[PDB]
Design a protein around this ligand. Structure first.
Ligand SMILES: [Ca+2]
Lengths: 190, 125
C-alpha cells in the first residue's frame, strides 16, 4: 500500500531484475571489462524488459551536472527535479533507470573524468527521508551468496535540493552524486 | 601446509609467463599483482577490480583432499592444487560459494621463488 510517512509506495524491483557485474568475461578481456560499466548497466536494463536501444548518449538525456565559487555551480536544479520525477515515474511503472554519476569524493583517478553509471532499482523512506536503491556494476565482490553490487546498502539519499547522493556497499570511499539521467525505450514494434 | 605462501597470479603471454602489476579499478594509485596469500589465520584474496579481501580463517570451512589438495570457503570457494611443485607453481580455482560459476583459475607462483618479471599493466591500449 501507500506509505503513511512519505505518501508513496515503497518499490524494490531487485527480485525481478537480475544483477550484472561489469567484471564478467562476457564483456571480453580485462581491458574490455575495465570500460564495460555502461554495457553491464545496459544488460540490467534489458533484464528488466526494456529495449537494447535504451539509454542513448544523445540529447534526450536529462543533464543535471554542467561544466572562489558556490558548491552548486555545476548543478542545474531544475534538471535535478526533472530527473527525480522521471526516476519516480519509471520505478512506479516497474522499470529501473540507468544514470550517470560523478564523485563528490573517492574518484579512482581525480586527473580524469572517466564516465561511471549505476542503475536505480528501488525507492523507500525512513521517517519521510527518501532513499533510492541502486545496482553497482563496478564491483565483482560477493558476499552471502550474492554480488555486493546488488546489496540493499547501495543507497542514494534524496537531498533538500533534489539531488541524489550516496555510497556503494563495496567501497565506502566513493561518494556519488547523480549528474545525468538516461531514457528508457520500451520493447514495442513501432 | 603447502598452500601457506603469497601466491602471485601469472599470465601467459606471447613472450612467456609474466606477473602483471595492476592499478586497481577502485583506485589507480593502488598498484599490485593479483594474488592469494595465506599466512596463519588469514586468507587474502586480491583482484585487479576490487580492494583486497582479508578473511579470517577461523571462520572459514577448510577441507583437505588427496595429494596435497585443499579447499577454503569464506565468501568464495578456493581450491588449491599443485601444478608444478618443483617450479613452486600452483593453481587456485576460485568459485562462488554455490560452486556454480568459476571466477578464475589462474596459475600462481610462490613469491619467494618468483623469477617472472613484474610488468606494470597498461590499461589504455
Ligand atoms: Ca515511506
Amino acid at each position: 500500500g501507500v506509505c503513511p510517512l512519505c505518501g508513496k509506495k515503497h518499490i524494490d524491483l531487485r527480485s525481478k531484475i537480475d544483477y550484472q557485474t561489469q567484471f564478467d568475461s562476457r564483456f571480453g578481456t580485462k581491458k574490455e571489462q575495465n570500460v564495460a560499466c555502461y554495457k553491464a548497466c545496459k544488460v540490467i536494463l534489458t533484464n528488466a524488459g526494456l529495449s537494447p536501444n535504451s539509454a542513448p548518449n544523445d540529447n534526450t538525456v536529462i543533464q543535471i551536472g554542467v561544466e572562489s565559487h558556490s558548491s552548486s555551480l555545476t548543478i542545474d536544479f531544475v534538471k535535478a527535479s526533472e530527473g527525480l520525477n522521471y526516476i519516480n515515474q519509471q520505478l512506479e511503472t516497474g522499470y529501473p533507470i540507468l544514470v550517470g554519476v560523478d564523485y563528490k569524493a573517492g574518484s579512482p583517478n581525480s586527473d580524469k573524468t572517466t564516465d561511471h553509471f549505476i542503475v536505480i532499482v528501488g525507492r523507500g523512506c525512513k521517517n519521510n527521508e527518501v532513499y533510492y536503491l541502486f545496482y553497482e556494476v563496478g564491483t565483482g565482490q560477493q558476499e552471502n551468496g550474492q554480488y555486493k553490487g546488488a546489496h540493499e546498502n547501495n543507497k542514494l539519499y534524496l537531498k533538500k535540493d533534489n539531488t541524489l547522493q550516496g555510497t556503494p556497499y563495496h567501497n565506502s570511499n566513493k561518494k556519488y552524486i547523480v549528474v545525468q539521467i538516461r531514457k528508457n525505450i520500451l520493447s514495442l514494434e513501432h | 601446509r603447502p598452500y601457506e605462501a603469497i601466491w602471485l597470479a601469472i599470465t601467459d603471454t606471447d613472450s612467456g609467463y609474466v606477473v602483471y602489476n595492476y592499478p586497481n579499478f577502485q583506485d589507480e594509485k593502488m598498484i599490485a599483482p593479483e594474488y592469494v596469500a595465506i599466512r596463519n589465520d588469514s586468507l587474502i584474496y586480491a583482484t585487479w577490480h576490487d580492494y583486497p579481501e582479508k578473511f579470517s580463517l577461523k571462520y572459514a570451512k577448510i577441507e583437505n583432499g588427496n595429494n596435497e589438495q585443499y579447499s577454503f570457503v569464506t565468501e568464495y570457494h578456493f581450491s588449491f592444487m599443485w601444478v608444478d611443485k618443483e617450479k613452486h607453481i600452483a593453481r587456485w580455482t576460485i568459485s562462488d560459494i554455490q560452486k556454480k560459476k568459476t571466477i578464475s583459475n589462474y596459475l600462481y607462483i610462490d613469491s619467494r621463488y618468483n623469477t617472472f618479471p613484474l610488468i606494470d599493466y597498461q590499461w589504455d591500449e
